[PDB]
Amino acid sequence: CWLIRGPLEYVPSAKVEVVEERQAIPLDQNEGIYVQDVKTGKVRAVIGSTY
């Protein structure tokens, strides 16, 4: 699985398949979200700008 992002337009090819929509989260300084990287399990607690 991989995420494609940017101000652009997409057409899913026959091979690929849309899993999910992935709306971003707006964050300012001294605020963030706890992200667990399931590929490695590590939790990062990413704070600061939007993510």
């Binding site: 001294n30 605020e31 963030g32 979200i33 706890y34 939790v43 990062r44 607690a45 704070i47």
Partner: protein, 51 residues
Amino acid sequence: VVSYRVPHNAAVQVYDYRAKRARVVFGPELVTLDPEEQFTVLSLSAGRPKR
């Protein structure tokens, strides 16, 4: 995120178990806990005479 706004004449102590590191901060700052950070909740005496 779990974040606490410390009062001006106050201090909060936290420990990051994932990093095995203690840190205590005094004054009026906004502390944000890392995913394995824990606060030092203090039980204190109060009441009319004392408790």
